Symmetry: D2
């Protein structure tokens, strides 16, 4: 069987025929892969930056069901939930390894579990999300979107501690969000916050790309060029109710944006920072205390969030047709090894989502 394989914690990837008999199987439903998606976590594994001799790569997949089994029909498109329970703690037991208390959960194509960049795989109905044909084109995005659905869901649940966090009209329309970092995570955060009616500011250290500009216009989102800092934003707009870190960046970005957090506000840590150290002085922290501010680490969506992601992706073909068309950067054939290896090892400038097609 053709698979895309890695041999961790060593760097490198191959695109090759492997023994289907040594690959991990997860239940009785056979699924023939049609698309994979590639993200930074995939790049990391390829560049060694993170029984079996190899691991199958990939945690973003849509496949087709080959024969009807119980809930699922032949020809149904499905997406597997990539994070799976440790089998021990109460969070995993209730289907919620995003809150696993042992850290011993499985991750498809990362840890303890062959991924899904392979011709086909066997999975269990309980881990499969139905992907309506009507969103087949952008449906691969339900996986990453799922983390963000979980994040926004959580940030809203936490904000229930504030007696009234709604506006005069009963909505969250008057709440402002600063999303730092564009890239597929910042873009998805923006789209989903806009869907919920909040006002959003996107910030990058540069002017917008064409995708971002289309996002601005179509969703009525604001953009702030943050190359010389945040002072002008705070002077022009004042403070934000929610701030999302969506950069894989130097934690010092947190020093820059923390002073833009408003009363009762939330700083959502979602990006996985790779460099730096950020000083917090006593005046900063005492202010956090005085104004009921919260900082929260945001991670991993589970099945309910994949299903939310599907409904939202569906709404975005209606509401935001032009942005939705720009979500998929390009599709690369599983058969074009040179171009595949290239996209696998490296992100192109301003990439949203690279897709793998198995044909």
């Amino acid at each position: 069987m053709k698979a895309i394989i890695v041999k961790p914690p060593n760097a490198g990837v191959q695109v090759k025929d492997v023994d289907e008999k040594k690959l991990d199987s997860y239940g009785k439903i056979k699924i023939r892969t049609i698309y994979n998606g590639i993200c930074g976590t995939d790049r990391e594994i390829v560049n060694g930056k993170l029984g079996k001799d190899f691991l199958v790569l990939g945690h973003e997949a849509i496949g087709v069901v080959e024969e009807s089994y119980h809930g699922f029909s032949q020809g149904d498109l499905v997406m597997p939930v990539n994070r799976r329970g440790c089998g021990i703690c109460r969070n995993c037991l209730v289907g919620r390894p995003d809150f696993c208390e042992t850290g011993e959960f499985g991750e498809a194509g990362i840890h303890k579990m062959d991924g899904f960049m392979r011709e086909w795989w066997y999975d269990d109905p309980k881990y499969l999300v139905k992907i309506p044909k009507s969103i087949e084109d952008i449906g691969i995005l339900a996986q990453p979107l799922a983390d963000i659905e979980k994040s926004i869901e959580e940030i809203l649940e936490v904000q229930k501690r504030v007696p009234v966090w709604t506006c005069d009209d009963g909505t969250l329309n008057c709440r402002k969000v600063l999303v730092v970092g564009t890239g597929p995570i910042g873009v998805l955060f923006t789209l989903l916050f806009r869907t919920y009616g909040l006002e959003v500011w996107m910030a990058n250290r540069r002017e917008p790309t064409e995708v971002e500009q289309t996002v601005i216009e179509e969703t009525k989102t604001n953009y702030y060029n943050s190359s010389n800092g945040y002072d002008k934003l705070k002077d022009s707009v004042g403070k934000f109710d929610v701030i999302i870190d969506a950069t894989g960046a130097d934690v010092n970005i947190l020093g820059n944006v923390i002073p833009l957090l408003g009363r009762n506000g939330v700083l959502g840590l979602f990006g996985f920072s790779t460099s730096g150290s950020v000083p917090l002085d006593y005046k900063t922290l005492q202010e956090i205390v005085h104004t009921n501010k919260t900082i929260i680490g945001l991670v991993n969506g589970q099945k309910p969030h994949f299903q939310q992601a599907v409904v939202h992706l569906a709404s975005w073909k209606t509401l935001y047709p032009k942005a939705a068309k720009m979500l998929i950067t390009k599709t690369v054939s599983i058969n074009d090894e040179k171009e595949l290896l290239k996209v696998l090892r490296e992100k192109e400038h301003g990439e949203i989502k690279i897709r793998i097609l198995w044909e």
Copy 2:
């Protein structure tokens, strides 16, 4: 100005030109009506089945176009007014939530205290206006009915947070089953939104499915039960439900029939406004409700956040359920086609989901 008007104790409806000076104005934004919708409350008022003013403008379902760029609203934007507005006194109303008004002294447009929206144009306050994207103009009139249901289901899920774990093995609610009694617009919209949330649905009506219901069945993967001879056969083959919605305008004895089909920790959602009957509640039924943590909840009125959720869900349905979505508007009537207009105002058509009025 052209207006559809009623003279509220009395039966009667007229489509005539009326003195604009006399019509309630609610703010600074001028909006030219393009669509109204009609519901059973309109019919009821039209047949007299329900203050210095001679007449009342009918109608609480409206889309209009913003005449002149105002603050946040562009010349040309479609908007929908929130029909229930606060009593100005209680804490729920002051936070934008008269659906939970504590005085009961709230305003209802086209119904009580408030001229409605079946008139050429009106003035409003932005805080009462929901933006309707052009990409959902065709079925967007449905955001007003759907708002009540978004609120009812949001509430049902908030209430069920009393159960330590009401989610399923996979972390979802896909294993929860909803029985929806009553088809037609409320029943149909409950089904679609519960399916959208991923729950299993049975619609039930004392008859075989209409064309629209059959379409939803097939497109949404929904189950149907002919309840003409009661519920014994549904109980025996499917068992009990986690949620039951009364969406019938029916006789309250309906509850005596569906209550035995309520499962452990389940919710009976009373949404329909019953207009006849008395239902006996035996001590064994009642002490079973006690032993099994059952809840009966009266469900009423969506507000602005729910209109906005309705908008997002109508938009998802155009993609996800394209055949059912395009069948939610039964037909459009011109304001200038008087004979037909008068007929749709007076009575409902068999299998009608929504009749829309277009202003030309």
Copy 3:
């Protein structure tokens, strides 16, 4: 071993020595009974009003002393067993919460599947044991009944989070009024806990107050209503309630009487297990429930966190309401005083709150 035993379809109760080998053991901790409490469920079983085993040990209310230092439990500690234990299958039971058991296949000690606690000693699992401080030994038997009520009120407040603002101008619930129908231990404990939370309370019984009720009235600042002639006079003078608790074991027609006294957004808490009657629910009553967001909720069973809250609240009452607290134990009977013991098991005394059994 000395044990109070019953032979569950049948009426009859005996206090005799029984084969220890035959009694259900639940874990590794040995506990010597010092107190039992008696409630109406015991009486019911004793009068036959409700598996390789000949007899069942009665009683679900117990304090014992830890015989031998175990893990977390010191030789000499008082403990109380949680009486309802999970079915081992469903998600609610697996998180320690069989009060919301989805199979209904839970165990109940001294009642069904499970030998009770009216026996000299038993073995248990620490996860089922609540620590009873010595400073509340006198009234600590009450933590078992109070646990059901802590759970019912916790639930009522969780449910009322559906209302955007259910707090008062001062940010509290002091302006919310509770009607408690039924006095005696459940009604009395509901009153005390709702007062503890700061809400206004009216107790109601079809008679003038007993000595104990009068004491609570005065000490807790609670209101009383003689309901002998219905509720019209309470409605006319006080108006409507935000919460009404049925704590009567009564006839379900009681609900037909108190339902008109439920206010907007209010909750009818069904806690009492009614054993006769059929109550008619008219369409106007039902559509009013709809328009005003009313909720009817079946209230059942406290679990461990609620026993522990009960413990904290019993302790607060010794300070805050010292006269009422010392009247919650009506009297203590010796296990060795058989004639009297048999009488308290068979029937309740007028105005009894709690009869305690002491093991000597």
Copy 4:
């Protein structure tokens, strides 16, 4: 009228007769003060560290109602809520200026509002908490305890984001709390967490005082001497589900205790740090992200929390009689000016609560 007055932002305090006619009045109920309490905020104002020529000091008070008015009877003991709404935002409007969005709320004896160290004052029923005579002796503590009730209430509400944060028995008994800093805030946090059934560790850079030792024994609380750091605690006990900063300290304490925070855990910032700067490296922050950790600033209890505080103080006379007796360090006469001025300007070693008696 005798009052204890300050002339902000200048340092200094006087104990003297003032013109009752220039003092702030808040409603129609007249209250003759009996006790005040003194805390660090009072010390700060006295040492200038933070129409009218002076402000009456003090936000901790119990008084007696002089005549029956509406709800309140002659002889009823009452405590005023010290923080009061800005009159503009929705949080204040619902009685919750702990979440005020303008920052323009009033604070008795600090800001915009004469305090309560004065012979008597006029207040509004809506701001008054009933103090049962049965807890008159320790009842002054309801004010500070109120902030902590609000804090624990909030930390628990936030933890509802975790699908199951309860233990196998349905309780929070298996959850561990680290309370850093003893002193009245750390002590009250400890007592209240123990009341809720959680296991608690108190930490100071020294061995326990007599009060603390009585707290340990009577509540079955643990103590860790943290003078040489937290490594031995983490080695012996492992990680904590909740960590409370109750020190007025150098923010660097946060660097020391953050690595003791466990999965899904909460760091509650309650103390107002006065010195220092704390570096957060990328490995620390990325870990926060991976494990759904939250940091939250904790501030101010309102009327419902004062009423909770009363019920708990009442339970603690039953449950923890010896600790409860040690809560009041000493009572000082309003008439002993030298000793009053002394306690007003400075905290004595290991002080829990100094009381002022008006006789």
